[PDB]
Amino acid sequence: QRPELKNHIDRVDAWVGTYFEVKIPSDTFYDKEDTTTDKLKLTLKLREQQLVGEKSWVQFNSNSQLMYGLPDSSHVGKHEYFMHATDKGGLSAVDAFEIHVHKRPQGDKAPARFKAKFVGDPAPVVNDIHKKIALVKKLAFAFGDRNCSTVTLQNITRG
Amino acid sequence: TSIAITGSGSCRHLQFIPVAPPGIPSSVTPPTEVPDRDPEKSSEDDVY
Ligand SMILES: *[C@@H]1O[C@H](CO)[C@@H](O[C@@H]2O[C@H](CO)[C@@H](O[C@@H]3O[C@H](CO)[C@@H](O)[C@H](O)[C@@H]3O)[C@H](O)[C@H]2NC(C)=O)[C@H](O)[C@H]1NC(C)=O
Ligand SMILES: *[C@@H]1O[C@H](CO)[C@@H](O[C@@H]2O[C@H](CO)[C@@H](O[C@@H]3O[C@H](CO)[C@@H](O)[C@H](O)[C@@H]3O)[C@H](O)[C@H]2NC(C)=O)[C@H](O)[C@H]1NC(C)=O
Ligand SMILES: *[C@@H]1O[C@H](CO)[C@@H](O)[C@H](O)[C@H]1NC(C)=O
């Protein structure tokens, strides 16, 4: 049978330069043949049923059933996405959700401002969101931190 | 390659990366105070 839906995702709150990660709730979708979300295939899609690109600032892993991302100020504001829940029966249930990306609330008056210059071209690092999230989690691990969202990159300049 | 830890916000007067800065700012020059007083006058025409 076609899977059914009970709870929606209202909206996702994100901030520019901050890494967010959301695990889908276990009661998000239901099917008479499956009864659980984890035993059912979950995908993320755009308005006309196109997946997120590799270079997009938000990605989502199906096996870890985990969405994640880090937005930029050129993508501040609203955005829309669809969650598609496909069972073994080849039938898809659909939910929609909206993501609000805000500017950094502290803004310009931060009491601390860390600055560092590295080696090599920043073009592949900026062009790759994978490199960006690896960098953020690597700073977080360098401080020994768990929640990598505590890093807020503010600006990168080619030198 | 390089790390530059700098203060801002409430840490405006603080720099924390040791670059060995020898900068010694000067002192503000003392401006002469100029109070304006306008008392009344009897006519200097009394002289003539
Ligand atoms: C931003 O800077 C703050 C520093 O204030 C970082 O938060 C700090 O994170 C460490 C964990 O790595 C906290 O250590 C604590 O140690 C005590 C010792 O008993 C323990 O009880 C705590 O459970 C924790 O392990 C430290 O307190 C915490 N500082 C706070 C809360 O003020 C933060 O990670 C930095 N974020 C970055 C660099 O993105
Ligand atoms: C963060 O990095 C950005 C980009 O490196 C810096 O913004 C840049 O600021 C310079 C200085 O004004 C801009 O140069 C000139 O801008 C005017 C318009 O303002 C333009 O007409 C000139 O042709 C010239 O490009 C530069 O455009 C601008 N880059 C942008 C906006 O993308 C910014 O200063 C850095 N901020 C910090 C805190 O490091
Ligand atoms: C990590 O930081 C976020 C702030 O976005 C906070 O909500 C979360 O509780 C922190 N993690 C822990 C384990 O406290």
Pull the structure tokens for residue A146.
């768990």
Pocket of ligand 2, candidates A108, A155, A156: which has the most ligand atoms within 8 Å of its Cβ, to mutate? A155
Question: What one-letter code names the amino acid at A102?
Answer: H
Between A and B, how many residue pairs show a Cβ–Cβ distance under 8 A?
34
Breaks (C-N over 2.5 A) in chain A follow: none
**If we measure between CA atoms, which residue out of A79, A158, A75, A71 comes closest to residue A120?**
A158
Secondary structure class of B45 (helix, strand, coil): helix
Quote the DSSP letter at residue A74.
G
**Min Cα separation B23/chain A (Å):** 21
Residue A107: closest C-alpha in chain B: B9
- Of all protein residues, the one whose alpha carbon is nearest to atom 38 of ligand 2 is A155
Question: What experimental approach yielded this model?
Answer: cryo-EM
Residues 6+ apart with CB under 8 A from B30: none
Nearest atom in ligand 2 to the alpha carbon of residue A155 is 1
Distance CA A43, CA A27 (A): 16
- Establish how many alpha carbons lie within 13 A of residue A131's alpha carbon, considering only the half-sphere containing its beta carbon: 9
Asked if B1's CB is within 8 angstroms of A115's CB, the reply is no
Return the residue matching tokens 């203060």. Answer: B7
Query: In whole angstroms, how far apart are CA B9 and each of A3, A84, B14?
Result: 53, 45, 10
B7 contact residues in A (CB cutoff 8 A): 111-113
**If we measure between CA atoms, which residue out of A120, A119, A118 comes closest to residue A153?**
A118
